[PDB]
Amino acid sequence: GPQPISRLEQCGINANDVKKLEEAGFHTVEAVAYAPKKELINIKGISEAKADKILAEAAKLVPMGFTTATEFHQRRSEIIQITTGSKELDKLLQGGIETGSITEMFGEFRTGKTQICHTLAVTCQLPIDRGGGEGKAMYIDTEGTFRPERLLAVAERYGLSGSDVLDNVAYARAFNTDHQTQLLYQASAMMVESRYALLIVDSATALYRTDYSGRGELSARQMHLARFLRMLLRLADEFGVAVVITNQVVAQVDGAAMFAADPKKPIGGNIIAHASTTRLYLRKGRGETRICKIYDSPCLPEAEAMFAINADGVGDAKD
Amino acid sequence: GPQPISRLEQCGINANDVKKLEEAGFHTVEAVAYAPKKELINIKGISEAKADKILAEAAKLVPMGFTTATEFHQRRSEIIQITTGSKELDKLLQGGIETGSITEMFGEFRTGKTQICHTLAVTCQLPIDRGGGEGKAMYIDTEGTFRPERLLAVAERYGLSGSDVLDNVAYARAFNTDHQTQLLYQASAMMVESRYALLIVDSATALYRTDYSGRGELSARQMHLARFLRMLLRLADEFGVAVVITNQVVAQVDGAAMFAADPKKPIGGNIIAHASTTRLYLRKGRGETRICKIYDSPCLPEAEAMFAINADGVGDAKD
Amino acid sequence: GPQPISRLEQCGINANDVKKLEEAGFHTVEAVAYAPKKELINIKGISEAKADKILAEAAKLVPMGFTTATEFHQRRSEIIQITTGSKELDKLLQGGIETGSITEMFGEFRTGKTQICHTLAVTCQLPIDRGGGEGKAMYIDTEGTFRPERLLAVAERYGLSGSDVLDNVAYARAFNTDHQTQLLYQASAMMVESRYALLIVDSATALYRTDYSGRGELSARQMHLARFLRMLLRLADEFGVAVVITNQVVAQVDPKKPIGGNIIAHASTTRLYLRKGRGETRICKIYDSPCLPEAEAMFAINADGVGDAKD
DNA sequence: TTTTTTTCGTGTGGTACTTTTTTTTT
DNA sequence: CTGACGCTCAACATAGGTACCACACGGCGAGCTCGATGCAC
DNA sequence: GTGCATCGAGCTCGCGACAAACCTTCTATGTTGAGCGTCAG
Ligand SMILES: Nc1ncnc2c1ncn2[C@@H]1O[C@H](COP(=O)(O)OP(=O)(O)OP(=O)(O)O)[C@@H](O)[C@H]1O
Ligand SMILES: Nc1ncnc2c1ncn2[C@@H]1O[C@H](COP(=O)(O)OP(=O)(O)OP(=O)(O)O)[C@@H](O)[C@H]1O
Ligand SMILES: Nc1ncnc2c1ncn2[C@@H]1O[C@H](COP(=O)(O)OP(=O)(O)OP(=O)(O)O)[C@@H](O)[C@H]1O
Ligand SMILES: [Ca+2]
Ligand SMILES: [Ca+2]
Ligand SMILES: [Ca+2]
Ligand SMILES: [Ca+2]
Ligand SMILES: [Ca+2]
Ligand SMILES: [Ca+2]
Structure with a gap:
């Protein structure tokens, strides 16, 4: 299954910020990684500087790059x-x-x-x-x-x-x-x-x-x-x-x-x-x-x- | 039966706003809770800030979440x-x-x-x-x-x-x-x-x-x-x-x-x-x-x- | 019987407005009250503001709410x-x-x-x-x-x-x-x-x-x-x-x-x-x-x- | 003091008509 | 080694017969109609 | 006091496409042609 959003505290994300994300409807790391930077900015208490750090850390845990069609098949x-x-x-x-x-x-x-x-x-x-x-x-x-x-x-x-x-x-x-x-x-x-x-x-x-x-x-x-x-x-x-x-x-x-x-x-x-x-x-x-x-x-x-x-x-x- | 709309004022809604709601056809808490935010905005003297607060209180008195099919059965x-x-x-x-x-x-x-x-x-x-x-x-x-x-x-x-x-x-x-x-x-x-x-x-x-x-x-x-x-x-x-x-x-x-x-x-x-x-x-x-x-x-x-x-x-x- | 449409102007309707209604086929207050808002708007010279007022005044003279079946019987x-x-x-x-x-x-x-x-x-x-x-x-x-x-x-x-x-x-x-x-x-x-x-x-x-x-x-x-x-x-x-x-x-x-x-x-x-x-x-x-x-x-x-x- | 930028979005079914053709004596 | 003949399926075409029908936003502005106010003997 | 004239207020009707784009063939019964098994020589 998907990784719970609590995994972000292991990557240095403040637990307060994680709780702000959960109030915004993000409960898994995949949800955060798939979200655009705009959505995180709209969340109160998440500045642009914090948003970049959150997205970078989430991208480490979720594969979001290119892959062969053989693997996808x-x-x-x-x-x-x-x-x-x-x-x-x-x-x-x-x-x-x-x-x-x-x-x-x-x-x-x-x-x-x-x-x-x-x-x-x-x-x-x-x-x-x-x-x-x-x-x-x-x-x-x-x-x-x-x-x-x-x-x-x-x-x-x-x-x-x-x-x-x-x-x-x-x-x-x-x-x-x-x-x-x-x-x-x-x-x-x-x-x-x-x-x-x-x-x-x-x-x-x-x-x-x-x-x-x-x-x-x-x-x-x-x-x-x-x-x-x-x-x-x-x-x-x-x-x-x-x-x-x-x-x-x-x-x-x-x-x-x-x-x-x-x-x-x-x-x-x-x-x-x-x-x-x-x-x-x-x-x-x-x-x-x-x-x-x-x-x-x-x-x-x-x-x-x-x-x-x-x-x-x-x-x-x-x- | 359904709860009368006068129950809202016990949650901090102005009595004048309740009277405005009744003139618009909402006479129970359920009718307000089931109403979309659009309808409450159309009512004169109901600002969006009032509309959000009214909906928030109505949702507290009316169950509008998920439930087991066992309970619904x-x-x-x-x-x-x-x-x-x-x-x-x-x-x-x-x-x-x-x-x-x-x-x-x-x-x-x-x-x-x-x-x-x-x-x-x-x-x-x-x-x-x-x-x-x-x-x-x-x-x-x-x-x-x-x-x-x-x-x-x-x-x-x-x-x-x-x-x-x-x-x-x-x-x-x-x-x-x-x-x-x-x-x-x-x-x-x-x-x-x-x-x-x-x-x-x-x-x-x-x-x-x-x-x-x-x-x-x-x-x-x-x-x-x-x-x-x-x-x-x-x-x-x-x-x-x-x-x-x-x-x-x-x-x-x-x-x-x-x-x-x-x-x-x-x-x-x-x-x-x-x-x-x-x-x-x-x-x-x-x-x-x-x-x-x-x-x-x-x-x-x-x-x-x-x-x-x-x-x-x-x-x-x-x- | 039905109330003549001239009773409307005693309730605040302009005399020229009543004339337009009569030329449109409304000769009693009941006929106006029973008419939908669409019919009045189609009359030239009557706007949605007028139609809302006319229907509101007509509803005061003509009962159009709920009633007991005993009364209807x-x-x-x-x-x-x-x-x-x-x-x-x-x-x-x-x-x-x-x-x-x-x-x-x-x-x-x-x-x-x-x-x-x-x-x-x-x-x-x-x-x-x-x-x-x-x-x-x-x-x-x-x-x-x-x-x-x-x-x-x-x-x-x-x-x-x-x-x-x-x-x-x-x-x-x-x-x-x-x-x-x-x-x-x-x-x-x-x-x-x-x-x-x-x-x-x-x-x-x-x-x-x-x-x-x-x-x-x-x-x-x-x-x-x-x-x-x-x-x-x-x-x-x-x-x-x-x-x-x-x-x-x-x-x-x-x-x-x-x-x-x-x-x-x-x-x-x-x-x-x-x-x-x-x-x-x-x-x-x-x-x-x-x-x-x-x-x-x-x-x-x-x-x-x-x-x-x-x- | 300077200096404009940018399109989005489908919804709605109604409404019946018209009758025709006789056959076979014991 | 083989052909005439009947069964069922696979694909195909027509059935009493007839046919038409239109609007709907977001909005400003000519425009021009008449009441409310002002003016000439 | 009577007839006449003007402005505010009201309600009514335009304004625009680029002149193509649409592709849907129905349910259901009986018909038409063909593939295939039987039987006799
Ligand atoms: N127990 C049942 N046995 C047989 N048929 C049933 C049974 N219950 C329901 N149906 C059939 O199911 C059919 C479809 O109903 P369903 O609720 O699925 O419709 P729908 O497609 O959701 O329609 P709508 O747009 O009205 O919601 C009905 O016509 C009804 O005859
Ligand atoms: N007292 C009665 N005894 C027997 N039959 C009756 C009685 N009253 C009415 N009916 C029958 O009821 C039938 C149905 O009438 P009803 O008013 O229900 O029709 P409907 O479905 O509403 O029709 P419509 O489309 O005209 O509104 C009529 O054909 C009439 O013969
Ligand atoms: N003075 C009279 N005395 C007796 N019977 C008469 C008289 N006048 C008319 N009738 C009968 O009235 C019958 C019906 O005529 P009527 O005008 O009512 O028909 P209808 O139902 O209107 O027919 P249609 O569809 O042709 O209009 C006729 O068959 C005629 O024999
Ligand atoms: Ca359904
Ligand atoms: Ca009926
Ligand atoms: Ca698709
Ligand atoms: Ca249904
Ligand atoms: Ca009937
Ligand atoms: Ca007749």
């Missing part, structure tokens, strides 16, 4: 992929949800965005040989649609004890975009103490659709949303967790899409399209089945797979 | 589900209408959207052991179709006093979309003084269909509708009432039958589909019987049940 | 139900046509939609003890099928004076959908000066069926029809008149359903389905209602208007 052979509960999705994702990267699932209502998040909150606790991340799950909810009954249904499927599954899911409810971002600061502190394997934000952009309304507030909305996605990327790099965010859709009311029966695109604009490394486009299928399409990915070919929402969470289409 | 085991008067619907909903969430019922004319709302306006006054919410009902009407004679019919079925039932229903008629939203501010003030168990908006989207006409006003329509649904969600979280809204349908005039799509869909677009946690799709049966289908839900399997609109409200089909 | 015990001239129809409607709501009658040709509208245009002038609304009737005709000779036949049945009955019916003929909506603005002005108990639009959707032809004009048709039904609803709330509209039918080729789509089905609080029976008898069926069970009654079109079947 070796590490990526060891990153954990979390099973989605469906063989077809795992074939589509070539293993499952990938840790250390931001994955976005979007689609219209009832398409299963919350159902997949509930499945992942349990499958991430399985041992690695069974397709899990072997760690606790963190669930940040913005819609109020977190249902522990669904988690117990999934835990029944894999033979896990439901009581222990619930204890390993940290749940927080976000009521506004400011609270949604503030929860991440507590998330970083929690992830230092115990090993978390998955972070779920559902829905990531639900609150931005109403806190910032109108074209007048669009620039402030995207700027605030972009800062939120940077913190998610920081947590993914710092702790190696898998970040799964859920997105909504907006209809295109132009006549350009004649060949599409109901054209719609995810909200968030270009800020969230670039930030997400993997985007899954869920849509309604026949009955209880749904279709997942690789909308964006650095390494996955654009393809479709069909899954179903069963009583015991997300699974393959039985019929 | 414990809390949800105590929420109230209000019976719909029909055995089949209660089985379909696994108990009845759930408090603390937005439930949307839609369907074409005559399908029984208003009849269910009339039954719920009475059943919610039953004691909890009989399937009620043991609270008063609030009925916001946007069509003029509120008939107290129907309430008296349902009250006779359950043996309740007709005069007592009518006194425990608060009725307001909304004449436009602006008035419909403004009634929610009065709703929060009323819900602080007396225990309300159910809030009915019927119909939630009837007035939006004509106040904003054409694609030119579509964006302003959905933005206004989205703000209305946020206030409904805020009331559900703040007071724990069940919010039941009613929606209309619009025909699909493309090759929906060619692609096997349904010929009619609810209005409101993606703004109302995402916001509603549970959506019920009522359709006409034979005679007085109707069919209710779970259109969207976080925990309910997509199924159907048959109910009837009897002389004494919504009930089970007698044939 | 008390008011609905005093609404007037206009007799349809038929014992069976009145039993089916539990009193007759209800004021303050939009009632829609549809059916194929010859079913008696216009005959009922002719009977209602007379019975609405009866004293309340005899089942009337004790007010004048307004008849907006879009088909050209208004026949004053039918009114005289109905008036003779109840003993009313034939000349007096015809003087209490305001008749207008609509030649297109734009004109049909525009007549409602003139209707609001007339209803302030005199007590009307019934407004009839026959037929409401007849002109929409041809002014907007094809799927290419369907959205424009339904948007225009929706605004027409909102204006009718505004009149029903503002003046407490019974609004009776008449609708046509279309065959389902997937056996006949009313035209207008979902816009008119949701808007209409009560819908009556009329169909042909033996001889001159007809059958009326409650197709939609918030409080009336779906039942059927049989009436007849006699020489003296709609009445009970003689079978």
Whole structure:
């Protein structure tokens, strides 16, 4: 795991300065090393002279230079992929949800965005040989649609004890975009103490659709949303967790899409399209089945797979 | 219940600022705690320095951090589900209408959207052991179709006093979309003084269909509708009432039958589909019987049940 | 009845502002209070500052807050139900046509939609003890099928004076959908000066069926029809008149359903389905209602208007 | 006393119509 | 050593049929309309 | 005292793109062509 920020006192950093950093949301050496000099300057009691010393010492403990692609290829052979509960999705994702990267699932209502998040909150606790991340799950909810009954249904499927599954899911409810971002600061502190394997934000952009309304507030909305996605990327790099965010859709009311029966695109604009490394486009299928399409990915070919929402969470289409 | 906003002044907030907050529609500590910093700044005489202090004190009285899913599972085991008067619907909903969430019922004319709302306006006054919410009902009407004679019919079925039932229903008629939203501010003030168990908006989207006409006003329509649904969600979280809204349908005039799509869909677009946690799709049966289908839900399997609109409200089909 | 809009300027509104409202179709305080802020802003010369003040002043004169269902139940015990001239129809409607709501009658040709509208245009002038609304009737005709000779036949049945009955019916003929909506603005002005108990639009959707032809004009048709039904609803709330509209039918080729789509089905609080029976008898069926069970009654079109079947 | 610098950000679904065609003696 | 014939899959195309629809910021300044104040017999 | 004239106040409507960029083909049933196994000689 990441090195706790207490290691800086061994490099001559004053314990008072270390405590100032923790109040600023830095709990690991990696978090300090990745932070720009501007962020440390903004912290009261951290002058520019102190900031240079802190960054220099942190860079000693964290490798931040060039390296061969051969070494990097070796590490990526060891990153954990979390099973989605469906063989077809795992074939589509070539293993499952990938840790250390931001994955976005979007689609219209009832398409299963919350159902997949509930499945992942349990499958991430399985041992690695069974397709899990072997760690606790963190669930940040913005819609109020977190249902522990669904988690117990999934835990029944894999033979896990439901009581222990619930204890390993940290749940927080976000009521506004400011609270949604503030929860991440507590998330970083929690992830230092115990090993978390998955972070779920559902829905990531639900609150931005109403806190910032109108074209007048669009620039402030995207700027605030972009800062939120940077913190998610920081947590993914710092702790190696898998970040799964859920997105909504907006209809295109132009006549350009004649060949599409109901054209719609995810909200968030270009800020969230670039930030997400993997985007899954869920849509309604026949009955209880749904279709997942690789909308964006650095390494996955654009393809479709069909899954179903069963009583015991997300699974393959039985019929 | 929620803590009154007067608790803030015990933490050092000026009583004049509290009065300014109440004039802006915040009547409980939860309403202030859930408010983003933007909303408090908009209120005249609330500086940013005041806004930060007000939010800081509110967060001390309201838990807004992470918690175990075990504790959240414990809390949800105590929420109230209000019976719909029909055995089949209660089985379909696994108990009845759930408090603390937005439930949307839609369907074409005559399908029984208003009849269910009339039954719920009475059943919610039953004691909890009989399937009620043991609270008063609030009925916001946007069509003029509120008939107290129907309430008296349902009250006779359950043996309740007709005069007592009518006194425990608060009725307001909304004449436009602006008035419909403004009634929610009065709703929060009323819900602080007396225990309300159910809030009915019927119909939630009837007035939006004509106040904003054409694609030119579509964006302003959905933005206004989205703000209305946020206030409904805020009331559900703040007071724990069940919010039941009613929606209309619009025909699909493309090759929906060619692609096997349904010929009619609810209005409101993606703004109302995402916001509603549970959506019920009522359709006409034979005679007085109707069919209710779970259109969207976080925990309910997509199924159907048959109910009837009897002389004494919504009930089970007698044939 | 409704308070004249001239009461606003006694509350601090400039006289010129009230003039602009009247030219925009607002003639009572209720009409202004019920209007959204958008409608007032669209009036040239009225800014968002004026609109906020006007709406604030109107809300003082018009109650628009929450109230007990007991109080509302008390008011609905005093609404007037206009007799349809038929014992069976009145039993089916539990009193007759209800004021303050939009009632829609549809059916194929010859079913008696216009005959009922002719009977209602007379019975609405009866004293309340005899089942009337004790007010004048307004008849907006879009088909050209208004026949004053039918009114005289109905008036003779109840003993009313034939000349007096015809003087209490305001008749207008609509030649297109734009004109049909525009007549409602003139209707609001007339209803302030005199007590009307019934407004009839026959037929409401007849002109929409041809002014907007094809799927290419369907959205424009339904948007225009929706605004027409909102204006009718505004009149029903503002003046407490019974609004009776008449609708046509279309065959389902997937056996006949009313035209207008979902816009008119949701808007209409009560819908009556009329169909042909033996001889001159007809059958009326409650197709939609918030409080009336779906039942059927049989009436007849006699020489003296709609009445009970003689079978 | 001198001396300007710098773009950012997408959102929003609506809306039903139209009937047609007779056949076969014991 | 081989060909005629039926089964199933893999790929492919059309289905009662029909089609249109627009706005929305951040803001200063002409502009020009009328009330409130001042002026000519 | 009557008719006339002016300034403050109000509310209304512009102002700008470089004239392309868009790529989406749907669900579901039955059809069309081909790959393949059977059986007899
Ligand atoms: N126990 C269950 N068994 C089967 N299906 C279920 C069960 N619980 C929920 N579902 C289905 O899950 C579907 C998707 O619900 P979900 O909460 O995942 O939607 P969503 O994509 O988050 O939508 P929204 O935008 O409204 O939040 C629903 O249509 C419902 O039918
Ligand atoms: N007392 C009663 N007994 C039996 N059926 C009744 C009774 N009152 C009303 N109904 C029936 O209830 C049905 C549904 O009416 P309701 O007001 O619920 O419609 P709705 O879904 O709100 O429609 P709309 O879209 O017009 O608002 C009507 O068709 C009517 O036949
Ligand atoms: N004086 C009368 N005595 C008896 N029956 C009459 C009399 N006048 C008209 N009728 C009957 O009224 C019936 C229905 O006419 P009405 O004008 O009500 O039709 P409608 O429903 O408006 O039809 P449409 O769709 O053509 O407008 C006719 O079939 C006619 O026989
Ligand atoms: Ca969800
Ligand atoms: Ca991307
Ligand atoms: Ca209704
Ligand atoms: Ca939803
Ligand atoms: Ca007629
Ligand atoms: Ca209706």
